[PDB]
Amino acid sequence: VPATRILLLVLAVIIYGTAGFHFIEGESWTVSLYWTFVTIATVGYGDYSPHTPLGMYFTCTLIVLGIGTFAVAVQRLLEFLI
Amino acid sequence: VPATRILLLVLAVIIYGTAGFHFIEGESWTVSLYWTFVTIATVGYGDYSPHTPLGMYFTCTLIVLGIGTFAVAVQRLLEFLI
Amino acid sequence: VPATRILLLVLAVIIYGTAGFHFIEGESWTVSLYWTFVTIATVGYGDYSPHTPLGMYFTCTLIVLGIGTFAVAVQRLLEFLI
Amino acid sequence: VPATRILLLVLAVIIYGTAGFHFIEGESWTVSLYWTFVTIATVGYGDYSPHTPLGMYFTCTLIVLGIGTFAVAVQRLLEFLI
Numbered sequence: 001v002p003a004t005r006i007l008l009l010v011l012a013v014i015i016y017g018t019a020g021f022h023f024i025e026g027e028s029w030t031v032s033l034y035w036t037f038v039t040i041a042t043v044g045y046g047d048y049s050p051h052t053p054l055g056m057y058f059t060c061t062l063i064v065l066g067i068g069t070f071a072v073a074v075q076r077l078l079e080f081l082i
Numbered sequence: 083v084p085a086t087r088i089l090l091l092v093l094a095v096i097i098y099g100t101a102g103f104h105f106i107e108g109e110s111w112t113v114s115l116y117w118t119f120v121t122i123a124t125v126g127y128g129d130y131s132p133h134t135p136l137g138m139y140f141t142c143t144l145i146v147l148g149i150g151t152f153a154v155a156v157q158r159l160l161e162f163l164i
Numbered sequence: 165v166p167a168t169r170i171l172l173l174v175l176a177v178i179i180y181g182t183a184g185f186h187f188i189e190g191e192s193w194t195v196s197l198y199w200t201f202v203t204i205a206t207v208g209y210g211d212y213s214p215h216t217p218l219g220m221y222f223t224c225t226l227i228v229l230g231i232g233t234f235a236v237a238v239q240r241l242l243e244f245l246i
Numbered sequence: 247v248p249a250t251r252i253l254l255l256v257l258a259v260i261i262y263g264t265a266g267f268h269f270i271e272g273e274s275w276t277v278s279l280y281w282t283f284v285t286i287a288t289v290g291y292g293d294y295s296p297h298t299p300l301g302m303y304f305t306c307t308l309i310v311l312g313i314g315t316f317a318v319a320v321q322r323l324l325e326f327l328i
């Protein structure tokens with residue numbers, strides 16, 4: 001898969017995660033973007049997390065759709081930095 | 083290993099994690115399912131965690147049985163989405 | 165590397181992590197073992213963490229020595245379960 | 247990529263993470279180094295995390311630049327220990 005396509009896929013995941021957390025959990029756009037990265041990178045500080053059943057369901061979908069995508073994206077970035 | 087078999091294996095892990103956390107730690111089915119995903123994806127927010135010695139032992143078993151299974155499942159899902 | 169040797173290596177990591185956390189941070193053997201798994205699996209709930217400078221240094225060493233070892237161990241366990 | 251070059255790359259990431267967290271979030275050099283390892287290893291206890299918008303942005307950059315680098319570094323260390 002071409003690296004630029006992988007870039008677009010991870011950007012789509014990031015938009016999905018950010019907008020979802022913002023609207024479902026009510027955190028700022030900035031906090032939601034931060035939380036999205038922390039989640040899909042699997043860092044998961046827990047400073048932010050879903051507190052609603054919908055937020056929890058949404059988070060599981062983001063986990064499934066985002067973690068693999070982010071992992072592949074970082075791998076490709078390695079090559080272009082190294 | 084066929085992707086559908088990997089699907090069944092991760093579903094079995096999810097049932098195991100969810101039922102175990104629910105019965106050992108006493109959280110709702112929904113919270114337990116959420117916690118199971120957060121754990122096997124290695125996100126681990128820490129908003130939920132075991133507070134009993136049995137829960138701690140159980141969590142270690144879920145970690146060992148689930149993390150690899152989930153990792154393989156997300157990899158295969160990548161291919162079917164991309 | 166033979167799977168049984170990988171088993172011994174991860175067991176050595178587990179002993180190292182458990183004894184270290186117990187003596188440096190003062191948590192029970194059970195809690196320390198649980199924390200060791202949660203850490204080397206990279207789950208990191210944060211329900212337990214080092215609160216001393218020595219504990220922090222020790223945790224970084226466990227992270228470096230343990231995360232790779234655990235990752236290889238789970239991969240090999242996959243094959244023997246599947 | 248030569249293992250020594252990978253060593254230098256992860257050391258550069260560690261300096262970047264430590265100095266950044268120290269200056270942006272105001273934690274001690276020791277705490278900042280610890281947080282850097284916990285973050286790039288993806289452990290993310292959440293005992294420490296950014297509380298400013300700049301810190302959050304910085305953390306996302308560290309996540310993107312550091313997680314892959316650390317993953318490759320631990321893999322190479324495995325070979326030299328085993």
Ligand SMILES: [K+]
Pocket residue numbers: 044045046126127128208209210290291292
């Ligand atoms: K956490």
Ligand SMILES: [K+]
Pocket residue numbers: 042043044124125126206207208288289290
């Ligand atoms: K984590």
Ligand SMILES: [K+]
Pocket residue numbers: 043044045046125126127128207208209210289290291292
């Ligand atoms: K975590």
Ligand SMILES: [K+]
Pocket residue numbers: 041042043123124125205206207287288289
């Ligand atoms: K992780």
